[PDB]
Amino acid sequence: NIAVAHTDHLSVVYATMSNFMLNFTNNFSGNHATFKPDQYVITSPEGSYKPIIERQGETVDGLTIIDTSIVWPILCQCTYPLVRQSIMEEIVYPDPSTTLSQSLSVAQVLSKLTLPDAFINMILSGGDSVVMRTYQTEADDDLDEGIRMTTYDQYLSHIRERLHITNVPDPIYITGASTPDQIAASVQATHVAVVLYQSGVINGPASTYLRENEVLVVMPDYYDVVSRFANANLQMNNNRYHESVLEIADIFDQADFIQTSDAVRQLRALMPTLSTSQIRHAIERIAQITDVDSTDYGKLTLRFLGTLTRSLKMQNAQIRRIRPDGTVLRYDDQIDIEAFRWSRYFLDELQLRRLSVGLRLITNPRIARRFNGVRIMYLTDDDPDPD
Amino acid sequence: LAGANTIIAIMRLFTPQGFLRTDDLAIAANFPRASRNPQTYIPYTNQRGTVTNEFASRFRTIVATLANVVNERAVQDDMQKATRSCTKQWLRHLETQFD
Amino acid sequence: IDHFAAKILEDWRQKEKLDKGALVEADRVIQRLIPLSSSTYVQRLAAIGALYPNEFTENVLDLSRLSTALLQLSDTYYQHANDQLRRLYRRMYNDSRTLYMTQRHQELLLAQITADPNILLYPYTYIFTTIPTSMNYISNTGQGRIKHSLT
Amino acid sequence: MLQQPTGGYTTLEQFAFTIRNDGTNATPTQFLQLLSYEATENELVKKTIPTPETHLPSARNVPGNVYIEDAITQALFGISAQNVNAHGYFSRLSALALPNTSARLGLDGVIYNSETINIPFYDPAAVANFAATYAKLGNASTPRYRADMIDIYAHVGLELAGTDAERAAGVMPVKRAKFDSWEGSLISLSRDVVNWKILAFLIDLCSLEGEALRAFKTRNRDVFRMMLFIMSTAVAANVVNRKVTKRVDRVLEYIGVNSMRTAGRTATITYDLSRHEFAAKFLQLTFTRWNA
Amino acid sequence: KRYFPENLEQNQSAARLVSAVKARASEADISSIHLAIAREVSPMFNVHE
Numbered sequence: 001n002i003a004v005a006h007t008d009h010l011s012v013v014y015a016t017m018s019n020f021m022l023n024f025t026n027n028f029s030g031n032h033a034t035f036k037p038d039q040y041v042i043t044s045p046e047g048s049y050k051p052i053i054e055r056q057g058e059t060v061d062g063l064t065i066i067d068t069s070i071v072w073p074i075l076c077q078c079t080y081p082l083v084r085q086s087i088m089e090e091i092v093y094p095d096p097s098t099t100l101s102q103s104l105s106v107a108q109v110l111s112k113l114t115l116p117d118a119f120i121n122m123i124l125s126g127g128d129s130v131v132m133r134t135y136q137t138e139a140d141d142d143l144d145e146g147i148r149m150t151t152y153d154q155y156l157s158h159i160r161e162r163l164h165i166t167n168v169p170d171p172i173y174i175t176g177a178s179t180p181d182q183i184a185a186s187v188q189a190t191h192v193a194v195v196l197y198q199s200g201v202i203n204g205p206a207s208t209y210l211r212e213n214e215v216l217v218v219m220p221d222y223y224d225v226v227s228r229f230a231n232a233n234l235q236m237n238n239n240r241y242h243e244s245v246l247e248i249a250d251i252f253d254q255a256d257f258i259q260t261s262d263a264v265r266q267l268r269a270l271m272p273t274l275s276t277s278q279i280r281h282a283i284e285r286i287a288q289i290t291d292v293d294s295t296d297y298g299k300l301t302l303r304f305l306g307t308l309t310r311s312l313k314m315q316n317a318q319i320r321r322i323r324p325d326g327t328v329l330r331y332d333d334q335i336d337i338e339a340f341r342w343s344r345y346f347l348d349e350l351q352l353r354r355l356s357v358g359l360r361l362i363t364n365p366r367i368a369r370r371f372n373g374v375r376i377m378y379l380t381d382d383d384p385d386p387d
Numbered sequence: 388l389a390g391a392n393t394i395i396a397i398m399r400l401f402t403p404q405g406f407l408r409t410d411d412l413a414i415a416a417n418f419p420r421a422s423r424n425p426q427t428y429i430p431y432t433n434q435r436g437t438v439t440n441e442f443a444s445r446f447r448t449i450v451a452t453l454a455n456v457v458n459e460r461a462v463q464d465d466m467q468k469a470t471r472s473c474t475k476q477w478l479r480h481l482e483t484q485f486d
Numbered sequence: 487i488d489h490f491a492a493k494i495l496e497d498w499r500q501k502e503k504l505d506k507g508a509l510v511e512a513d514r515v516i517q518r519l520i521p522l523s524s525s526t527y528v529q530r531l532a533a534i535g536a537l538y539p540n541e542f543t544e545n546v547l548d549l550s551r552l553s554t555a556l557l558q559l560s561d562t563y564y565q566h567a568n569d570q571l572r573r574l575y576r577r578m579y580n581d582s583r584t585l586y587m588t589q590r591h592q593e594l595l596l597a598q599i600t601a602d603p604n605i606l607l608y609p610y611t612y613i614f615t616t617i618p619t620s621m622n623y624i625s626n627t628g629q630g631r632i633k634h635s636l637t
Numbered sequence: 638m639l640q641q642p643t644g645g646y647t648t649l650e651q652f653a654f655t656i657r658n659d660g661t662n663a664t665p666t667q668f669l670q671l672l673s674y675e676a677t678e679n680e681l682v683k684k685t686i687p688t689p690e691t692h693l694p695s696a697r698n699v700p701g702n703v704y705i706e707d708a709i710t711q712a713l714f715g716i717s718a719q720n721v722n723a724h725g726y727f728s729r730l731s732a733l734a735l736p737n738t739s740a741r742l743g744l745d746g747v748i749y750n751s752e753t754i755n756i757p758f759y760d761p762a763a764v765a766n767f768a769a770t771y772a773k774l775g776n777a778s779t780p781r782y783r784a785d786m787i788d789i790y791a792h793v794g795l796e797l798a799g800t801d802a803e804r805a806a807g808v809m810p811v812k813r814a815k816f817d818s819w820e821g822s823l824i825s826l827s828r829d830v831v832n833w834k835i836l837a838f839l840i841d842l843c844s845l846e847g848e849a850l851r852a853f854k855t856r857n858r859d860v861f862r863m864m865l866f867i868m869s870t871a872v873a874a875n876v877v878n879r880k881v882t883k884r885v886d887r888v889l890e891y892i893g894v895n896s897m898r899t900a901g902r903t904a905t906i907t908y909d910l911s912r913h914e915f916a917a918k919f920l921q922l923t924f925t926r927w928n929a
Numbered sequence: 930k931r932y933f934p935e936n937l938e939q940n941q942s943a944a945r946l947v948s949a950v951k952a953r954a955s956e957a958d959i960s961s962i963h964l965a966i967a968r969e970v971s972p973m974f975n976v977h978e
């Protein structure tokens with residue numbers, strides 16, 4: 001008696017609601033045996049990931065507790081427009097405009113909601129760095145010159161997760177049996193110039209390759225590292241190296257992953273040393289400068305949401321499925337949707353387009369009117385040219 | 388040790404992130420010092436990069452290790468199963484405090 | 487995975503019967519499926535599946551847990567001592583959407599087209615040459631202890 | 638009207654094709670010199686291209702002067718173009734296909750319905766030749782007539798990355814193209830190509846015949862390859878940059894393999910599905926003309 | 930205090946966790962904090978426990 005209404009009416013309401021803008025995920029497959037929701041997170045290399053689905057346990061005003069008892073009223077004490085037909089209720093066909101205008105409002109809010117965060121994290125993306133020592137293979141090398149090295153710990157904390165995000169084969173261990181051509185094949189496979197060391201002394205042609213090509217060897221530890229190389233030149237020595245920082249931009253160069261323009265490079269060079277709290281302060285000030293427009297329904301969703309965003313690092317934040325076992329899977333072209341391959345710093349295509357023009361504006365010689373350095377000297381001011 | 392790798396690996400979280408420093412100024416000042424060659428171990432060094440903090444990144448690998456530890460923990464009670472995942476969330480929040 | 491497994495088994499039995507040269511009523515020349523979009527593991531199944539590896543004729547695989555064995559086989563082929571088979575398998579794994587077939591199949595496809603000109607068959611295909619392997623494994627699934635006579 | 642020379646319209650200095658590079662107006666060939674290739678394990682083997690359909694789509698009654706050139710060049714290399722099949726004004730090229738039509742394809746790349754004063758235009762016979770094939774771009778979208786968007790790219794690879802030997806063999810390893818590069822190089826290249834007067838190249842490719850045609854194919858091979866390069870960047874799965882001793886080398890992987898990818902990226906111009914069917918149809922036609 | 934993410938302190942599953950943390954978290958007191966800092970460099974004449 002109820003089944004006619006559940007099948008012939010409710011079904012077109014589920015079908016129509018399936019098309020709504022914000023119902024953005026698959027709900028089921030029909031297989032109880034195997035259906036597990038896809039589990040994306042907003043992972044970053046310099047922080048823990050935020051699962052999008054979590055047992056956060058907040059009831060969202062009782063949204064997440066499920067009373068099965070509700071089937072009883074349905075079967076027994078409820079009426080339907082179809083079941084009633086002996087009065088004939090006309091069916092209702094609600095206007096699109098009410099939900100659409102709401103869905104759009106939400107999309108308008110949450111689109112721009114991230115913007116100041118997005119901009120700053122877009123600038124700072126190249127700024128993450130690893131400490132690296134540069135030992136000198138030969139006499140009269142400038143301290144910048146020579147084989148470059150970093151602890152395995154630094155490769156883990158920074159370089160490796162970014163290799164996962166960039167979706168490339170893992171860099172080869174070099175055993176000293178290794179030909180320079182193999183190291184070349186590795187660097188061609190993983191576009192960052194890096195090779196993990198494994199064991200054994202490394203032959204000299206390979207060393208000249210690691211020097212000429214500025215490959216960053218990843219030594220497990222700095223214990224008598226000169227023993228590791230066939231120092232036939234006998235210039236290399238454990239006390240002879242130069243430690244320095246290496247920015248992620250100085251290694252990686254993927255376009256929508258890591259801003260790497262000489263303009264942003266320069267802008268970053270002008271920056272003071274930064275804590276995460278200083279960055280958060282930047283974001284809050286940029287937010288306070290531009291009070292974003294929103295429709296009244298958008299202010300309503302905003303205050304409903306409706307507070308902090310600051311807990312999550314977005315340094316090179318990406319969207320990636322995690323395995324239920326908890327490992328973060330590399331992007332898969334055949335599974336994950338294409339729009340997730342690179343968060344484009346969470347900016348719109350048009351903003352990126354304008355952003356290149358602006359980088360042309362900032363880097364312009366004519367507006368470089370902060371001047372550094374000065375010269376105290378005691379001359380007469382006879383014919384004053386500022387130049 | 389051959390069979391107990393996870394123990395040693397957990398133990399490596401306890402290794403200090405500072406450096407050993409000769410008491411240069413105290414030597415120059417001729418301050419009393421019972422050690423033949425004076426020095427103290429400073430718990431942490433200055434940040435050298437413009438953005439990354441070597442200390443906070445260390446803590447990140449620590450909480451990651453621990454999250455793997457809690458994750459690998461067998462539990463039988465349902466509440467224990469719950470506090471497992473909650474422990475994981477609270478770790479992931481401590482990470483940001485530390486940062 | 488389980489579907490791809492059963493189909494790989496079917497095409498291997500079929501190709502085995504074809505290679506013996508017997509006339510056979512193959513309902514379709516290449517029995518195995520062509521993933522268009524799948525996880526990694528399916529792409530491995532497709533790869534070793536298209537290899538028609540000697541191991542199946544030798545019964546080196548255990549068919550009771552087929553896909554597992556198939557995954558396992560793929561791994562050896564992923565790091566095979568033979569450069570030819572390894573480069574071949576890698577190639578098949580990177581182009582999973584392409585159907586791979588030996589020439590002796592391809593002539594059957596051409597015959598099938600010459601018979602019915604508007605027959606539809608999968609557009610994206612590559613004709614690899616089968617790589618010979620000399621390792622004649624003894625094998626026998628099924629009960630019975632072996633009573634060796636050592637030399 | 639512009640009379641067509643003994644060579645193509647491309648012989649005129651008015652129609653020179655030149656991408657900007659290193660502070661000068663480089664000919665496409667001396668940019669193609671900068672390209673280098675990392676071969677991989679995969680093989681591209683070119684199948685025979687299917688013959689383009691006999692059907693020429695109707696040029697429906699459009700009162701106005703369609704800007705055909707701009708449309709083709711933006712469906713091909715545009716930084717923002719999409720739904721190129723929605724309007725379907727490419728069919729308008731068919732109006733030029735008739736003998737003795739009053740329509741003229743202007744050097745501006747407009748299709749005037751009538752000959753008009755002070756607007757120079759191509760010789761109507763040659764344009765009828767060019768329209769006789771490229772009007773079929775109008776049915777790039779119709780289900781009966783879409784081009785393969787997967788197989789044709791192997792041909793692209795051969796005509797771009799191919800060595801003379803790999804080309805004669807008809808089978809080359811899949812290659813990873815690369816070149817020492819400046820900031821925003823692929824966008825600058827593609828915008829420098831969107832400006833090209835490609836109708837000159839197309840009209841000469843369709844009209845010229847005999848030895849005079851063959852000299853075109855050699856002289857303008859590099860131009861074809863440059864367009865091919867912008868397309869191949871449009872379909873490349875990824876476009877990494879490599880740091881190397883304070884010099885950056887842009888690397889697109891891979892030449893000759895359509896990834897079908899449609900999500901945008903800063904590095905290169907992007908195809909919507911419609912632009913995939915468009916470029917694939919364009920390639921079917923253009924290669925079908927190119928090999929004869 | 931900043932011990933718990935919002936609103937994990939409110940989640941029912943977290944009780945056994947939250948209480949555990951609350952068993953450990955001493956209230957801040959500058960004398961004790963400064964003392965913890967100073968003990969790092971002051972000499973130890975009676976083995977600490």
Ligand SMILES: Nc1ncnc2c1ncn2[C@@H]1O[C@H](COP(=O)(O)OP(=O)(O)OP(=O)(O)O)[C@@H](O)[C@H]1O
Nearest residue numbers: 526529530533557558559560561562563564576579
């Ligand atoms: N049999 C295979 N066929 C094709 N590719 C493989 C194969 N095995 C591994 N790979 C590739 O090499 C990487 C190796 O991953 P890893 O071996 O750590 O775990 P896995 O992918 O489960 O493989 P395995 O099952 O061998 O452990 C994978 O990312 C995969 O892309």
Ligand SMILES: [Mg+2]
Nearest residue numbers: 496513514517
């Ligand atoms: Mg069947």
